[PDB]
Design a binder for this molecule. Structure first.
Ligand code: NA
Length: 577
């Protein structure tokens, strides 16, 4: 095979006989400041492509290299970053190729396997590092993980998937592939034909480089149009937050979380013993106890070891920030939000030797947001004077005073608050309290709760009547996250703004946290519900404490402009304390 052996010096296998090595002159304007033209050797296709998408490209080996190529980067503002790797899991794979697409230029492809001189990469590294160069990516979290793990400081990322996923206003589950997005906004059907490629071998296939290169080219025009649609429907803030939240997410996944095997397998054998005890064993006893221990055992304790990286005893879960309807985070394999909320269990999660955990929580942020969005004078003033809404509600229900209040009144107040705020009638309220609070409150009594509640909280009353009357399907957030319902659901309609705003505060907090937590080399570990976990060296204890508090408070203060959030923090050696 002579045609196949045609471009072996460039580590390319010519299968379809469709590749051409062309050496020509390029019109650069760099060097010093004068227009300096330079000759390069690029590759082109014999077969002409249908629509107008760049397919010409350079390949970079340690053998063949031209410093002048770096001059292409000089004075750019955005580029199409797209890498190909030897698999999925970064920790057990290597980066094959790294591609950069530049306006009106053929794609630049670094071959990482054949390269060996570091000097070359300095161009790539400088670009990726350059805070002022926008790197356009498809599924940026993935590539970003690989790069950060392979030590490539990246910054200023624009994610096409995020853009497309937001412009969807969350009304479609599928249709977010590169081909689909391009086919939609650019109106160009990609040739596709991408079979299961093997980047592991040192010979690069012919067609795969073309298609791959195109997958970079389209990111430019696509970035332009998507950018335009974003700034049109006012989603700049959202995009800013999310696209900046990429790196924090990568930090979470890369850092993982260490687990103690002693207490783990101890609890395994113990709960297993109690399980078999219940197996050998009124009604509530056998049923609830057996199935409870069964879930804690099989559905948790037996599941967890699957994701334990044996040698490190770390769990590296995968996070998602747009697969959630509300907008909050979602973790999978395992699902951290699915793990029980007890002390005995979570105790098995520990920091590393010279490190220590810091765990922050947002207190009553749901009702705080609801208070501002609703703009209820009574609730806002109650918060401004540092008073728990449950204490308030309890005082309004029982007509007691703050000294004469008692814990049970706060209990009832909790049921009433979390019940009625999210819109529900006194009947369902009785069921809700009777189920989740075990309170035999008469229907008349719950009616009294309803009337007193809404009679006092006129803000909430107006909010409810507004939503219930307009019966809108479109809904937004303080970050302006638009969502479209299929049908008008009252509860969901009331709930979405709150949950969404909460999510926004969490993400913005993680971004600010990721940027502030660098000096003491502090690590981000976890974000579940309304609590965040960071791991820092025992030296930076009080420091990291102040940092975390200030960061979250700055976020909550960014969105909320007339409510002060209470961030309760605990410096711990365990998740449970
Ligand atoms: Na790709």
């Amino acid at each position: 095979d002579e045609i196949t052996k045609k471009y072996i010096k460039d580590n390319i296998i010519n299968v379809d006989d469709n590749i051409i090595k062309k050496k020509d002159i390029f019109k650069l304007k760099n060097e010093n400041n004068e227009i300096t033209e330079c000759a390069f050797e690029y590759f082109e296709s014999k077969k002409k492509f249908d629509d107008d998408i760049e397919s010409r490209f350079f390949i970079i080996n340690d053998n063949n290299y031209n410093e002048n190529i770096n001059l292409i980067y000089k004075d750019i503002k955005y580029c199409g970053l797209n890498i190909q790797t030897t698999g999925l899991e970064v920790f057990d794979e290597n980066i094959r190729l790294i591609q950069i697409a530049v306006e009106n230029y053929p794609v630049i492809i670094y071959d990482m396997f054949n390269i060996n001189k570091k000097d070359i990469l300095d161009g790539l590294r400088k670009v990726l590092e350059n805070k002022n160069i926008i790197k356009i990516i498809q599924n940026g979290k993935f590539d970003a993980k690989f790069l950060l793990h392979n030590n490539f400081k990246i910054e200023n990322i624009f994610d096409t998937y995020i853009a497309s996923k937001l412009l969807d206003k969350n009304k479609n589950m599928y249709g977010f592939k590169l081909n689909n997005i391009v086919e939609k906004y650019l109106n160009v059907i990609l040739d596709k034909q991408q079979q299961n490629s093997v980047w592991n071998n040192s010979l690069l296939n012919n067609n795969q480089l073309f298609y791959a290169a195109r997958d970079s080219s389209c990111l430019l025009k696509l970035y332009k149009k998507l950018k335009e649609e974003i700034k049109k429907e006012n989603l700049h803030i959202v995009n800013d937050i999310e696209n900046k939240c990429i790196l924090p997410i990568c930090d979470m996944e890369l850092n993982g979380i260490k687990v103690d095997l002693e207490n783990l397998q101890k609890s395994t054998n113990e709960i297993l013993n109690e399980l078999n005890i219940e197996k050998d064993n009124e009604e509530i006893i056998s049923l609830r106890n057996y199935r409870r221990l069964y879930k804690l055992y099989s559905a948790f304790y037996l599941k967890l070891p699957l994701h334990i990286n044996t040698k490190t005893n770390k769990i590296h879960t995968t996070f998602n920030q747009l697969k959630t309807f509300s907008g909050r985070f979602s973790s999978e394999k395992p699902n951290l939000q699915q793990i029980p909320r007890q002390k005995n269990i979570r105790e098995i999660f520990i920091p590393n030797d010279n490190n220590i955990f810091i765990i922050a929580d947002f207190k009553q942020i749901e009702l705080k947001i609801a208070a501002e969005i609703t703009n209820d004078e009574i609730m806002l003033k109650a918060y401004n004077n540092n008073i728990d809404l449950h204490t308030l509600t309890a005082s309004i229900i029982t007509k007691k005073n703050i000294p004469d209040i008692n814990k049970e009144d706060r209990h009832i107040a909790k049921a009433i608050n979390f019940g009625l705020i999210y819109g529900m009638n006194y009947v369902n309220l009785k069921n809700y309290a009777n189920t989740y609070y075990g309170l035999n409150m008469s229907l008349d009594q719950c009616l009294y709760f309803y009337n007193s509640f809404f009679e006092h909280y006129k803000g909430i009353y107006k909010w409810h009547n507004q939503v219930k009357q307009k019966r809108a399907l479109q809904y937004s957030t303080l970050s302006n996250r638009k969502v479209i319902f299929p049908y008008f659901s009252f509860t969901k309609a009331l709930n979405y703004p709150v949950q969404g705003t909460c999510a926004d505060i969490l993400k913005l907090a993680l971004v600010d946290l990721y940027d502030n937590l660098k000096d003491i080399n502090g690590k981000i570990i976890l974000c579940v519900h309304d609590e965040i976990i960071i791991e820092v060296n025992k030296k930076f204890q009080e420091e990291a404490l102040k940092i975390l508090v200030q960061s979250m408070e700055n976020s909550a203060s960014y969105f909320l402009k007339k409510v002060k959030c209470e961030v309760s923090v605990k410096i711990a050696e365990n998740w449970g304390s």
